[PDB]
Design an enzyme around this catalytic site. Structure first.
Site, PDB file in Angstrom:
ATOM      1  N   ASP A   1       0.827  -1.208   0.000  1.00  0.00           N
ATOM      2  CA  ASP A   1       0.000   0.000   0.000  1.00  0.00           C
ATOM      3  C   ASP A   1       0.865   1.263   0.000  1.00  0.00           C
ATOM      4  O   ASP A   1       0.791   2.106   0.898  1.00  0.00           O
ATOM      5  CB  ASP A   1      -0.973  -0.006   1.183  1.00  0.00           C
ATOM      6  CG  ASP A   1      -2.044  -1.071   1.051  1.00  0.00           C
ATOM      7  OD1 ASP A   1      -2.402  -1.419  -0.095  1.00  0.00           O
ATOM      8  OD2 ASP A   1      -2.530  -1.562   2.092  1.00  0.00           O
ATOM      9  N   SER A   2       1.689   1.380  -1.037  1.00  0.00           N
ATOM     10  CA  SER A   2       2.546   2.545  -1.212  1.00  0.00           C
ATOM     11  C   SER A   2       2.981   2.612  -2.667  1.00  0.00           C
ATOM     12  O   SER A   2       3.065   1.588  -3.351  1.00  0.00           O
ATOM     13  CB  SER A   2       3.766   2.493  -0.284  1.00  0.00           C
ATOM     14  OG  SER A   2       4.581   1.371  -0.571  1.00  0.00           O
TER      15      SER A   2
END
Ligand SMILES: [Zn+2]
Ligand SMILES: [Zn+2]
Ligand SMILES: [Zn+2]
Ligand SMILES: [Zn+2]
Lengths: 73, 48, 46, 67, 343, 48, 117, 48, 275
Positions: free
Chosen positions: E58-59
């Site tokens: 999640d980046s």
């Protein structure tokens, strides 16, 4: 140790003393020796000073509590 | 006079947190044992 | 300081040295506007 | 809302082509023709001009705009 | 953006976009809901690649040069208000400009950025120490007498100071009265917001990702003509959550970019978005599967794999990384249990 | 009253002995960085 | 701004230095260079010039952190040829090569004032 | 559960099995670049 | 060093907004390092300091100042003679570096007036501003010859602001980038075999593979070498394409000469000898 108006220093008679909000310490200009014993902050307790109610809600909560008087009907 | 302060041996200086300091790094909330371990600091920009 | 608020309807300034309750001529509403700060402000083009 | 100059991917100008793209659609209702006469060739430049709305025409329609 | 008139509204939480670009691959159902006129982002070219492995869990990885040109630049609009109400029978607030000697309780700040009326003017570099609204109030009055006048008397400093976190500038100052019959004030603080490393972002497909790291244009890979990507997402984030629709927008946006027509994104159509769309992309001069090869931005060696490049519409969440921080060494301590304050 | 402040309903037990606040701490947003070591934790410049 | 300014990424300070001469404490006759405020733009060409030279046994470069700006060079040559002359002769060959490229570039652009065809 | 907690997955897992693939043959200029990337190294280049 | 590779420059086609050239006989590290110089290295003059005196339009001041520095200012007037502000040790600004840019416009008519870059005058001496009907004297422009539009001012809107033009380059900020994009390509037949190309029939032929028309579907070559590097530098309008390369090759040697001087300074300060 009772003659403590607002300024005091064990080395020299203090005259002025600021009240920092970013640190909450009694920084002295001419030296820097703090007085210690930090109570509630003036800036942190701004909204809870004097008019510490929900917009005019006296009724003085001490004995005869009656939330009316002004702005409370 | 910040550049002229009389200091001797036996004082305490509250300096910055330089590199090489072992600090704890927990999780919050904690579920198991290996969730409150320690690590070494490392200066780097941005609040990350 | 001549900056004494600006009306929001007729868009006219007051420029008086008094403590009036944000009153203005002809128009009687309370929509008050304010000028710009007269000070050397350094911005950026990044 | 005022298309900027130089695309975010390549860098070709496109900010000064919005005033000419609206004029070519009146005399030529073809999307593949007005996008070619403006020098736009790659797909990175067509994205900045086509996928852009001009909402400034609805903001300038107000009357209280003087103070 | 959410409306049109941005100068008449003074909300505490308002964020606008400099260039509200409409999404390319969109559906015809949102045309009636007024979505293409008020979007929530731009059509950033998202190239699925691994880069250096900094876009993990999640980046994403963005470009530092792209942000400098206007990549998701927002303005933090926050409006304040202070009601000038009574404080008793003969006690009330008075908007004035006292001095250091004619008043008490000014902690440490001075009135160097205030006005004579008791307020601040638009265009003053306010910070986390200055006063935005200055006002005083008295309480003893007749109680403090017997050679106790001097110059401050009983003038208590009850001014409104800005919290040590907002470092913006005053934009609009509005003074009016409500139904309570009291003349209050309402100012707005204008702050500059830039997508720095650590801010929370999201996506239109559901694969949210914060700003992992941002490099320059030279430190990022490029294709043949010089198409530099804007957002690098983890290729393993697709099979871990079975997000197949994310690859559809990345491929449909490339075909519509070479044609110049707003392609429909109807999920129940008979145009076959598998073979017909893939065959049309190979006619313009690209690969039919949408896969392209890039070059190394440090050594110049050809990439073995094939980076699937294509535009993808994202958004921007309201989670400031610089506002959620909280750190203190030694500050104000309460008196009830000798503990720190709230937050 | 006096019992509620010590019973546990947000009194001197749950709100103080079981849930108080400490000093010297930091809580930001974590970011991945495999280039660092197994003990090199991120430290922002504003926090330092 | 919490991060460093735009000029700090290349401009040095009054207490910082550029290249640093440091010797190795492992293999005999070796030096470990350290150049501050520099990315992979310069470190990639130093290894290429030392790899083609057969008088160099080992040559490499790394960075302590990619977000920062610092490169180091650890070269190991023969015990007879000093490693200090390997990096010195490598920086002179790159300048002489780029100087000839600019001279030939100005002739080709000035050999067609009207057109090649 | 007498087992370690350290896990190496996601991006640090596919590149491991791909680096040891039979269809991988590094050149001469890429070996010396990876030797310097090592945090520790005795200083002995292996035999090709 | 005795043996060395010699450069080979062959100009293909040069115009006014882009340039195409082919570089042969060079190392792979040189082909990647020359691209990083053609973007963020050439010093370009642009607007840095911005001050808004009076504004009564529909846009705030933080939006106009961001678009002012993004304007591609031309640099065809020898910008290397300008001294940096950090090395001039003067009083903040000086006419020797900062170029005074003043703007003054007022819309009094009823119809909407378009404010472009022509209203931005300058109190500085006769120095060429931005490309906006001043340099292109040959009647052969686009249709009106414009670069950027400020804001559509209506009846009752003024705009007065001051700005300076400092000195910078692309590494400091992306607004000092004179080149839009630089193309790069070498050996379209894939001789080094750095990748695989699954099914070469689906992969189309690029514009550079016409000179080597091969029908064997990506031929193999074991004894390969990075030879013949294609280039297509396309500028954004801030500097002449064939001039950017001339200003980058001279600036790249100055950075390498600084390291050679610093290298000899460390030898004299240390107890190690080279002679
Ligand atoms: Zn003292
Ligand atoms: Zn009025
Ligand atoms: Zn483009
Ligand atoms: Zn100067």
């Amino acid at each position: 140790l009772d003659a403590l108006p607002r300024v005091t220093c064990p080395n020299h008679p203090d005259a002025i003393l600021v009240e920092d909000y970013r640190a909450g310490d009694m920084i002295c200009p001419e030296c820097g020796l703090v007085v210690g014993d930090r109570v509630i902050d003036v800036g942190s307790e701004w909204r809870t000073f004097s008019n510490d109610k929900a917009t005019k809600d006296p009724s003085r909560v001490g004995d005869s509590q009656n939330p009316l008087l002004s702005d409370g009907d | 006079k910040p550049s002229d302060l009389h200091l001797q041996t036996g004082y305490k200086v509250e300096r910055h947190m330089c590199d090489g300091d072992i600090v704890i790094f927990n999780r919050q909330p904690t579920l198991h044992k290996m969730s409150m371990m320690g690590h070494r600091v490392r200066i780097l920009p941005w609040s990350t | 300081q001549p900056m004494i608020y600006i009306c929001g309807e007729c868009h006219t300034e007051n420029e008086i040295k008094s403590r009036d309750p944000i009153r203005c001529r002809e128009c009687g509403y309370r929509i008050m506007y304010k000028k710009r700060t007269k000070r050397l402000v350094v911005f950026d083009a990044r | 809302m005022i298309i900027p100059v130089r695309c975010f991917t390549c860098g070709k100008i496109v900010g000064n082509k919005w005033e000419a793209y609206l004029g070519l659609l009146q005399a030529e209702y073809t999307e593949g023709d007005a996008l070619d006469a403006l020098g736009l060739k790659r797909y990175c430049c067509r994205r900045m001009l086509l996928a852009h709305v001009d909402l400034i025409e609805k903001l300038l329609n107000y009357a209280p705009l003087e103070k | 953006v959410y409306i049109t008139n941005f100068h008449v509204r003074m909300d505490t939480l308002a964020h606008v976009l400099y260039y509200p670009q409409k999404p390319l691959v969109t559906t015809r159902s949102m045309e009636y809901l007024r979505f293409r006129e008020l979007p929530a982002g731009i059509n950033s070219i998202v190239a699925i690649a691994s880069y250096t492995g900094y876009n993990q869990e999640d980046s994403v990885i963005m470009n530092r040069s792209a942000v400098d040109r206007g990549f998701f630049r927002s303005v933090f609009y926050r409006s304040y208000k202070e009601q000038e109400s009574k404080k008793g029978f003969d006690q009330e607030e008075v908007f004035e400009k006292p001095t250091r000697e004619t008043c008490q309780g000014m902690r440490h700040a001075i009135y160097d950025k205030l006005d004579d009326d008791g307020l601040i003017a638009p265009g003053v570099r306010v910070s986390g120490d200055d006063v935005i609204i200055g006002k005083t109030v008295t309480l003893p009055e007749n109680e403090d007498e017997l050679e106790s006048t001097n110059r401050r008397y009983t003038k208590r400093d009850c001014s409104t100071f800005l919290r040590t976190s907002e470092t913006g500038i005053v934009d609009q100052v509005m003074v009016t009265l409500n139904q309570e019959g009291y003349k209050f004030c309402k100012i707005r603080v204008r702050s500059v917001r830039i997508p720095q490393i650590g801010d929370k972002f999201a996506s239109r497909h559901g694969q949210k990702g914060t700003c992992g790291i941002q490099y320059r244009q030279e430190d990022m890979p490029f294709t043949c003509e010089g198409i530099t990507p804007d957002i690098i997402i983890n290729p393993h984030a697709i099979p871990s959550r079975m997000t197949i629709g994310h690859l559809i927008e990345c491929l449909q946006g490339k075909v519509s970019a070479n044609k110049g027509e707003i392609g429909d994104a109807t999920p129940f159509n008979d145009a076959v978005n598998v073979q017909k769309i893939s065959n049309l992309l190979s006619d313009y001069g690209y690969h039919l599967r949408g896969n392209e090869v890039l070059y190394n931005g440090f050594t110049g060696r050809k990439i073995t794999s094939q980076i699937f490049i294509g535009p993808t519409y994202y958004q921007r969440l309201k989670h400031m990384v610089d506002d959620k921080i909280h750190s203190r060494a030694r500050g104000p301590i309460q008196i009830l249990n000798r503990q720190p304050m709230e937050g | 009253s006096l019992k509620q402040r010590l019973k546990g309903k947000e009194g001197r037990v749950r709100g103080n002995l079981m849930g108080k606040r400490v000093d010297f701490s930091a809580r930001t947003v974590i970011t991945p960085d495999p280039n660092l070591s197994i003990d090199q934790v991120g430290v922002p410049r504003s926090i330092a | 701004m919490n991060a460093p300014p735009a000029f700090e990424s290349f401009l040095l300070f009054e207490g910082e230095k550029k290249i640093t001469i440091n010797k190795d404490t492992k293999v005999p006759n070796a030096c470990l260079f350290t150049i501050n405020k520099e990315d992979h733009t310069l470190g990639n060409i130093i290894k290429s010039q030392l790899l083609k030279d057969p008088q160099v046994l080992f040559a490499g470069y790394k960075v302590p952190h990619p977000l920062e700006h610092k490169i180091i060079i650890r070269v190991q040559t023969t015990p007879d040829y000093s490693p200090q002359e390997a990096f010195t002769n490598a920086i002179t060959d790159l300048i002489s090569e780029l100087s000839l490229l600019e001279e030939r570039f100005r002739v080709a652009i000035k050999d067609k004032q009207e057109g090649i065809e | 559960s007498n087992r370690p907690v350290m896990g190496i997955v996601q991006d640090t897992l596919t590149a491991v099995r791909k680096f040891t693939k039979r269809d991988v043959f590094l050149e001469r200029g890429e070996v010396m670049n990876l030797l310097m990337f090592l945090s520790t190294w005795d200083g002995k280049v292996p035999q090709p | 060093m005795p043996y060395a590779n010699q450069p080979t420059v062959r100009i293909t086609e040069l115009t006014d907004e882009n340039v195409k050239f082919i570089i042969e006989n060079t190392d792979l590290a040189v082909a990647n390092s020359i691209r990083r110089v053609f973007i963020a290295e050439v010093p370009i003059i642009a607007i840095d300091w911005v001050q808004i005196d009076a504004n009564s339009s529909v846009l705030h001041d933080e939006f106009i100042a961001h678009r002012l520095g993004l304007i591609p200012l031309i640099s065809d007037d020898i910008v290397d003679k300008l001294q940096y502000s950090r090395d001039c040790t003067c009083e903040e600004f000086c006419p020797e570096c900062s170029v005074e840019f003043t703007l003054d416009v007022r819309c009094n008519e009823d119809q909407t007036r378009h404010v472009t870059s022509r209203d931005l005058i300058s109190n500085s001496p006769r120095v060429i501003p931005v490309t906006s009907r001043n340099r292109d004297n040959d009647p052969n422009d686009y249709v009106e010859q414009d670069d950027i539009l400020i804001v559509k001012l209506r009846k009752g809107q003024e705009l007065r602001l001051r700005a300076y033009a400092k000195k910078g380059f692309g590494k400091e900020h992306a607004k000092w980038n004179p080149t839009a994009g630089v193309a790069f390509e070498y050996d379209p037949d894939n001789a080094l075999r750095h990748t695989v190309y699954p099914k070469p029939e689906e992969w189309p032929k690029s514009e550079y593979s016409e000179l080597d028309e091969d029908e064997s579907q990506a031929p193999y070559d074991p004894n390969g070498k990075p030879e013949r590097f294609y280039y297509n530098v396309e500028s954004c309008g801030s500097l002449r394409p064939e001039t950017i390369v001339l200003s980058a090759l001279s600036g790249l040697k100055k950075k390498l000469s600084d390291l050679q001087t610093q290298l000899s300074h460390e030898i004299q300060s240390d107890v190690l000898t080279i002679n």
